């Protein structure tokens, strides 16, 4: 009558587009996809050349949400994370103590527009500002160009702004045709 039931589910997110974030509610399973909200910056010959106006805002997101995914970049909604040494959820007892890390801001670094014709002209587009979690980024050990990504086997724990938390184990970074950016994970979420 006073501890809410744990929500144990799997999800598959299409994060293939450089332009987009997918916002994920782990309590309800709802998702929403929106174009990145920053001012975009075209880099040409190693310097900031052109701007593309900022469009929309996070107020356009209707659902509550916990994590968001852009390609293999993972952020939280003002949350914090650790990578445990465990490989199985049953070995992570409760909310572990540890050195939890909040999301960081990265300037003119996250790709929002990328193709080979422009790359050969030394041109590509980045988010003016973006938020990414430096612990969750480690879910990928290696991502060699043209080749299979290598995933961490660690269980992550993420603490959310309402006091909830989840154990998360990532299982796939490609679909069954080996297309990169289809991100799958299992999780166990404790509601408050």
Residue numbers in the entry: 5 to 196
What does the paper say about this structure?
P. gingivalis is a heme auxotroph, therefore it must acquire this compound to survive and cause efficient infection establishment. Amongst well-characterized heme acquisition systems of P. gingivalis is that encoded by the hmu operon, comprising HmuR, a typical TonB-dependent receptor involved in heme transport across the outer membrane, HmuY, a heme-binding protein, and four proteins with unknown function. The work presented here substantially extends our knowledge of P. gingivalis HmuY by presenting data on further structural characterization of this protein and novel data on a second member of P. gingivalis HmuY-like family, Tfo produced by T. forsythia. The comparative analyses of HmuY homologs suggest that not only the HmuY hemophore-like protein of P. gingivalis, but also T. forsythia Tfo may be engaged in heme acquisition.
Similar to apo-HmuY, apo-Tfo exhibited topology typical of all-β strand structure, with the main distinction apparent in the fold forming the heme-binding pocket, where two long β-strands in HmuY that form one side of the pocket are replaced in Tfo by four shorter β-strands. As compared with apo-HmuY, analysis of the 3D structure of apo-Tfo confirmed differences revealed by spectroscopic analyses, mainly in the fold forming the heme-binding pocket and the lack of two His residues coordinating heme in HmuY. Tfo lacks the two His residues that are required for axial ligation of the heme in HmuY. Instead, Met, Lys, and Tyr residues are potentially available for binding the heme. Based on spectroscopic studies, we assumed that two methionine residues are the best candidates. Although the apo-Tfo structure exhibited a ‘closed’ form, partly caused by malonate binding, MD showed that it could open up to accommodate the heme. Comparison of apo-HmuY with apo-Tfo showed the same kind of opening of this region and it is the ‘same’ loop, containing Met149 (Met169 according to the numbering of amino acid residues in the full length protein) that moves significantly compared with the crystal structure of the closed conformation of apo-Tfo. Importantly, they demonstrated that heme can be bound to Tfo efficiently under reducing conditions, which favors coordination through Met residues. Moreover, reduced conditions influence properties of iron coordination to methionine more significantly than to histidine, thus allowing efficient heme binding also to Tfo and heme sequestration from the albumin-Fe(II)heme complex by Tfo. This effect could be explained by bis-Met heme ligation in Tfo, which results in stabilization of the reduced state as compared with bis-His ligation in HmuY. However, to date we do not have structure of the holo-Tfo, as 1.8 Å data collected from brown holo-Tfo crystals only reveal presence of the apo-form of the protein.
